[PDB]
Paper text:
To study this aspect, we individually refolded and crystallized [name]*02:01 with spliced epitope candidate KRAS5−6/8−14 [name], non-spliced epitope candidate KRAS5−14 [name], as well as two control peptides (peptides #1 and #2), in which either the N-terminal residue or one of the central residues was substituted, as compared to the epitope candidates. The global superposition of all these four peptide-[name]-I complexes in the peptide binding groove reveals a similar binding orientation with a root mean square deviation value (rmsd) of 0.124 Å. Throughout these interfaces, extensive hydrophobic and hydrogen bonding networking is seen with the majority of peptide residues participating in the contact with [name]-I residues Y7, F9, M45, E63, K66, V67, H70, T73, T80, L81, Y84, Y99, Y116, T143, K146, W147, V152, Y159, W167, Y171.
Two peptides - peptide #1 YLVVVGAVGV and peptide #2 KLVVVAVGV - shared a large portion of the KRAS5−6/8−14 [name] and KRAS5−14 [name] epitope candidate sequences. In contrast, peptide #2, which has the removal of residue G in position 6 as compared to KRAS5−14 [name] peptide and a G to V substitution at position 5 as compared to KRAS5−6/8−14 [name] peptide, is not competing with the reference peptide and thus ignored by TAP. The superpositions of either KRAS5−6/8−14 [name] peptide and peptide #2 or KRAS5−14 [name] peptide and peptide #1 do not show any relevant differences.
Numbering used by the authors:
A (entry chain C): 1 to 9
B (entry chain B): 1 to 99
C (entry chain A): 1 to 274
Write the structure that this text describes.
Amino acid sequence: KLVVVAVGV
Amino acid sequence: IQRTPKIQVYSRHPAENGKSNFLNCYVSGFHPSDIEVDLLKNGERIEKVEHSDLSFSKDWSFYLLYYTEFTPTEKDEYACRVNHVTLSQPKIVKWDRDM
Amino acid sequence: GSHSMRYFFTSVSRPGRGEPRFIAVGYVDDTQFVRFDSDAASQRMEPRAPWIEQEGPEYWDGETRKVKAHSQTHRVDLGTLRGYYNQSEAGSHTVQRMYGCDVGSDWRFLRGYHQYAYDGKDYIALKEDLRSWTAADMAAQTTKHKWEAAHVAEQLRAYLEGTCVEWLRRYLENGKETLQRTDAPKTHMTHHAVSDHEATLRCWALSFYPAEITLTWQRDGEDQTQDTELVETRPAGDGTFQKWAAVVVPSGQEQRYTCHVQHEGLPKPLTLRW
Ligand code: NA
Ligand code: NA
Ligand code: NA
Ligand code: NA
Ligand code: NA
Ligand code: NA
C-alpha cells in the first residue's frame, strides 16, 4: 500500500 | 549526471537449436532514463519486443529488461542495439550463447 | 530472513509538449507486484503478480488515487526544483523517489526509508531514526526546512512503522506460495579452451530467487580474484535471476579450482569442481 500524501519539495 | 548503459545479451534458458527460448537484453547503470533498445535478428529489428517497467538501483541508475520469444538456430545471428545520450553511435552487442 | 516492500517512482519532464512521464513500480523483495505508467491506457494502478489480484475494487481505487496524487506532487516538484537550481524551461529533468520498509527475522518492523533524487544525484533522504533528514545541498536544505515545519518525518514514520509493515505482512501471507519460497541456484561449470595452454572455467548460477547471491573462486582452498570475471546479477524474465563467475586457469590444473555458491536457498554453500 502507498503512502496517503506526498508533500512537495 | 550522465552514466552509459551496461549491456548483457543472453537467453532465459540454455540455448538448443530448434527449442523455443527467450532472448534478453538487460541494460543497467544508465542515466538519464531515455534509451532506445532493439533486439536484432540478422541485423533486422524484431517487432514483438516487450520490456520491464523502469526501475533503478541504490546509485539512482536505471535498469530495463527487453525480451522476445525466439527459437535459436545454427545460422541466425541475434544482437541487442542500444542508443543513449552517452553514446556517439548506437552500440550493437552480439548474443554469445554461453554468456 | 528479512523481507522488504519498496516503491520506486520516476518523473521525467517533457519541455517540448505536455506533462512529465511518470512510472511507479511496487516490489515485495525481488518480485514486482504493481505498476503505474502515465503513458499506459488504463490510467490505473495495475497488478503484476497473481497474489495481488485477490485485492478488491476499494484497494485498486485507493492505490490509483494515491499514485495519481504522487504523480502530481512529482510534476510540481520538477517546477520547484527548476526554480531552486535556476534552470531554464528548455531542458528535460528527472525526479526519483524510493520508499519502503523491512521486517526482520522476527517479522517485526526492522527499518524504513524514503530517498529522493534530482537528475540522478542524492537530494534529500530520511535518516534511519525516521526523525531527521540528510539534505545534499542548499536546495535540499530549503526542502528540509519546509519538511521539518510540516512534520513530514512524523507522517512517514507513522506509515513506515504502521501501514507499510502491516500490508507487507498481508502480501507475504497472500503470496506465500512464491514470496516465502526460496529457489536455490541450479549450478554447473563450463570449460572453454582460450589457447593451447589455458582454459576458462565458468561457474553458472541459474533460476534462483531471491537475487542476493555470492560466487567465489578458490585455488587450492584460498580465494582467487586474479584472472576472474563476475557479471552483474541479471533477471531471467520468469521472476528468477542468473549470475556467472569465470577464472582463466592453466590447462590440466582445472581440479585445483573450486567455485563456492552462497544463497538463502542453500542450507550449506555449494562447492563445484571440474
Ligand atoms: Na498503469
Ligand atoms: Na516506452
Ligand atoms: Na496507466
Ligand atoms: Na511491528
Ligand atoms: Na533523479
Ligand atoms: Na520532518
